[PDB]
Amino acid sequence: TLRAAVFDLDGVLALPAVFGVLGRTEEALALPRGLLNDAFQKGGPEGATTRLMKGEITLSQWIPLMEENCRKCSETAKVCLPKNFSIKEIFDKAISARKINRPMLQAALMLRKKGFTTAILTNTWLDDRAERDGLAQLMCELKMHFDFLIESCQVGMVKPEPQIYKFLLDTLKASPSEVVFLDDIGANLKPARDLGMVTILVQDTDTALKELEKVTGIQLLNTPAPLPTSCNPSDMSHGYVTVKPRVRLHFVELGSGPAVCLCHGFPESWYSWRYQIPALAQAGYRVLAMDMKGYGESSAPPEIEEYCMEVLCKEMVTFLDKLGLSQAVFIGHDWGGMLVWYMALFYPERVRAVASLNTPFIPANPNMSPLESIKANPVFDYQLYFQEPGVAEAELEQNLSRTFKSLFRASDESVLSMHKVCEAGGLFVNSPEEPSLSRMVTEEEIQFYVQQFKKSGFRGPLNWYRNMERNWKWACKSLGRKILIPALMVTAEKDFVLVPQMSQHMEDWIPHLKRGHIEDCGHWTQMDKPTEVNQILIKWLDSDAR
Amino acid sequence: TLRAAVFDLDGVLALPAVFGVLGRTEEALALPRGLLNDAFQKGGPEGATTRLMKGEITLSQWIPLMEENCRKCSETAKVCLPKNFSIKEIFDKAISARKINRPMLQAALMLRKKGFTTAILTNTWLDDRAERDGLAQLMCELKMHFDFLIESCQVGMVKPEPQIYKFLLDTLKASPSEVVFLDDIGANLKPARDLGMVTILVQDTDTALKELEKVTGIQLLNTPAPLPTSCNPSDMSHGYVTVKPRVRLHFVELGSGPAVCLCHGFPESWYSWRYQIPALAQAGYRVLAMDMKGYGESSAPPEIEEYCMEVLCKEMVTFLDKLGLSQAVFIGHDWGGMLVWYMALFYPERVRAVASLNTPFIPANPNMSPLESIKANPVFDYQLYFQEPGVAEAELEQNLSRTFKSLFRASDESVLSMHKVCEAGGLFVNSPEEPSLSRMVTEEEIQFYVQQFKKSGFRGPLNWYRNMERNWKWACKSLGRKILIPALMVTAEKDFVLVPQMSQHMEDWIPHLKRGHIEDCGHWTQMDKPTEVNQILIKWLDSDAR
Ligand SMILES: Cc1ccc(CNCCc2ccccc2F)s1
Numbered sequence A, B: 001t002l003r004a005a006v007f008d009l010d011g012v013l014a015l016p017a018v019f020g021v022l023g024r025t026e027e028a029l030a031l032p033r034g035l036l037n038d039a040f041q042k043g044g045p046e047g048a049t050t051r052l053m054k055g056e057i058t059l060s061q062w063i064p065l066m067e068e069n070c071r072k073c074s075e076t077a078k079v080c081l082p083k084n085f086s087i088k089e090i091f092d093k094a095i096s097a098r099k100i101n102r103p104m105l106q107a108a109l110m111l112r113k114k115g116f117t118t119a120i121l122t123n124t125w126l127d128d129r130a131e132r133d134g135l136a137q138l139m140c141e142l143k144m145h146f147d148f149l150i151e152s153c154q155v156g157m158v159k160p161e162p163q164i165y166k167f168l169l170d171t172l173k174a175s176p177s178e179v180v181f182l183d184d185i186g187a188n189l190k191p192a193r194d195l196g197m198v199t200i201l202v203q204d205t206d207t208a209l210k211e212l213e214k215v216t217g218i219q220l221l222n223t224p225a226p227l228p229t230s231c232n233p234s235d236m237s238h239g240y241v242t243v244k245p246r247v248r249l250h251f252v253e254l255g256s257g258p259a260v261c262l263c264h265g266f267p268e269s270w271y272s273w274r275y276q277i278p279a280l281a282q283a284g285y286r287v288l289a290m291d292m293k294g295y296g297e298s299s300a301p302p303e304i305e306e307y308c309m310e311v312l313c314k315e316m317v318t319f320l321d322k323l324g325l326s327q328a329v330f331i332g333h334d335w336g337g338m339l340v341w342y343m344a345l346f347y348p349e350r351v352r353a354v355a356s357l358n359t360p361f362i363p364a365n366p367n368m369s370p371l372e373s374i375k376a377n378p379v380f381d382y383q384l385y386f387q388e389p390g391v392a393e394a395e396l397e398q399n400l401s402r403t404f405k406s407l408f409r410a411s412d413e414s415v416l417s418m419h420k421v422c423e424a425g426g427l428f429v430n431s432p433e434e435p436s437l438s439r440m441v442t443e444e445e446i447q448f449y450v451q452q453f454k455k456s457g458f459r460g461p462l463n464w465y466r467n468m469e470r471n472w473k474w475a476c477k478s479l480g481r482k483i484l485i486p487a488l489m490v491t492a493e494k495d496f497v498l499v500p501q502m503s504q505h506m507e508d509w510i511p512h513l514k515r516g517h518i519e520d521c522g523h524w525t526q527m528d529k530p531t532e533v534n535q536i537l538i539k540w541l542d543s544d545a546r
């Protein structure tokens, strides 16, 4: 019967609360108990503070009024205020101290997932202090997870005035008995209770979730660790750059700070990075997630040599040039992995740092043809199957759903050995018509990939595999070099195609190479173990790229 | 007969040269004259330095070889090297010292403009030092202005080997007698002379330009001050963000650093900022140049209230949210001006700094209807003409060329008084069918605007003017506030619609307001006086926004 949940910000979705800094300051400075909270509330409905919350005056205009109020409250209680006593100081500090109460955010998230309409209703202020960006950042992180954010200072009303709750109900398109409202201030709860909303007085977070759990009938506490935030494609900024007459590259862009270019693998998409994109933005980076040449909304010219590494790389450089980026951090996976290593070797001036998931760097052997090298590894047999224009295209395009459902599987789920693929006659010859859905992917996510691959199919993606000789020759040019810019190699324990041991010699070529390793992780690193990927990439970025 | 010009980088397009740091170091440290230049050249065709220039080894790999060479050269001349003597030190310093020789760049630019194919041919290195971004930045700024950049370390050949000149000719698709080649090193000139190219030994820049001027027959020296770099639309990164179901915003994006959002006026385009975009990027900013709601590739819903300021502003905020930007600097002109002031007043947490060209901030008068206010100013008569849906649309759409040719004119060029526009019956009733081209705009530039306005015409742009009452009511909500974030107001001396004196009271609302003023500058600020605009905006950004 409950269908909507409404959260306050201070004391509920962010801790510690700013009222708490009034009280602790008093204590810390041994002033009359309550003195600062009296100054804060001075005048009530017609006092400075209400005008703030209603958006009549800015924070900075308020600061000297609160001064005046403290001066008067201390006069009447016959006490002095300390040398250098500063309300700007006290508030700057309070506001940077408050962080997101992670378990309250997680509960809000869970209820939204099961169908609730969620809202933040907060008494707040127009923030124009030199340090405002601090709060701008917090609000940004919170608001994306809610259906509505209602700000006292934007709508010109405040809790506990009754009109804001009517405005609230009217925003939810919900009747008061379909709504739970959590607040840490009981006076603000009263008018929600009068209209007959379920209310929760939030003292400690866990009790409130226990009450919230009871009353909604959904598990909220002790719930397993959730996934990272994923991307909704149609919420993204989509950018497009023509790097040369017949080729434009598409990317999705989120965040500010050092530019970080994500390069997906075969046969994938920018969306392969859907778990990393919000996390790395949040972590203070400008993420550009590409569709690599051949995929999605990027161009897919037909000719094979359009997909040799030399041409691919020159193109990524041109992409930086037209975006006006002198460098970026390049992070790749699978084929996008091989490319970033090559970007490091031929264009180190353009690469802030380089990282690869799964794909090791392995110099070309000048004494052995690349085709020999490939025949030397039973697990690469699929690549010889990929060579004949048309053959693999026909298999892979035949049933896109089945294709992505068969490839994107976790290590304990596979339906396709890479074994004697040529002999068998195809990559799917002995796998089902209608495979089950992997635990890694929802049905909607498979369908996005399917839709992307309707644009150009598999000729462009397959062409990446069809320049063995050209790439070998070009790579041979780099045999005298070492990679000496910052570099990270993440091995995936259960990738049976790019096995971790294939990376074992890499320190000969990259002496200060850094490492991560992910256990129980198959070939589709980013969606198999998103949390562990995010942690390893941010830690490395913050240490080596920042 | 000469059709191509080819420039070296070190000693020609960038000064001072890095060979000069070899010699001056020697002097500064009182070592044997030439000693460092001998170590540098040690081994010749098969020495460390050639392998660098050929791209066999990276800069960082070379550094300790050059060490070894200096050690050996000093041994043979029976002298010691100083305590802390450092080749990394010496080179880091050389490389940051070299800047673009502005007059050589300008000459290259001029020859490209008159039709030459231009190239940089340089002996250079794969740069992997911690400080490489320095050179990446220089190369970026230079290469955009040339048809080809040919790097010894990418093609695996070096001056003076004869094969690089053949590669050069083959890149230009030009015969040697159609080519002038400038170099500061005579040995490198020799093989160009053998093939019969015109060659210029560059010692001091001015003599070389004098020779270059003579031989090409084009003025290059003492030429008037050129325009800033403009944008080629199809070279830009184009981004798109859906801020709500029926509305997506288009912008062009260039550069990295603090995000700077440019908001054009009526009836304009992102392209109104074409002179500011490369300049501010170069100046170290992330420029986002919008098409504002109603224009170009942004959406243009029909309903008037879609263009009230409150809705426009909420939308710009949503644009930040979906891009993951907690703040941006907002810089507006004309209507984009009014908007940024309102962004400052209702969303100061999202605005790093605010600047307006021409548009003053003028609080709403709560005691006077906005229509009264408009009738009170003869020069705003055109705005009453704008009120009736359909009327102004029909005039403005009738002949787009004539429309933009009639509006975009410099102060000494006008063909349209704003005078009694309603009485006259239209904005163009007494101006020509086919106006001349303004000195401010080429024919191609008028045509871009024309093409943009074919998408949605003038209903959306005109609607901005059709919310006088709604904007007044909303603005009245902000009457108690002041703007206390950093703020710049640029007045245009000869803007006869937004006259400078209209800005005279602004310090009452914005006490720390900063100012610029541009003389002899009409309403179309950005294209009338691009250089002076760029200088005022960067100086203000570097001081107040950085
Ligand atoms: C540079 C590189 C060489 C080889 C690489 C691995 N490609 C595997 C793609 C793939 C293909 C088919 C099934 C699963 C699957 F994962 S990357």
Ligand SMILES: Cc1ccc(CNCCc2ccccc2F)s1
Binding pocket: B266, B267, B334, B335, B338, B359, B382, B407, B497, B498, B523
């Ligand atoms: C907030 C604002 C109110 C008025 C403004 C001026 N608009 C002028 C546009 C324009 C229109 C017609 C001709 C020239 C011309 F420049 S901005």
Ligand SMILES: [Mg+2]
Binding pocket: A008, A009, A010, A011, A017, A183, A184, A185
């Ligand atoms: Mg509270």
Ligand SMILES: [Mg+2]
Binding pocket: B008, B009, B010, B011, B017, B183, B184, B185
């Ligand atoms: Mg030189």
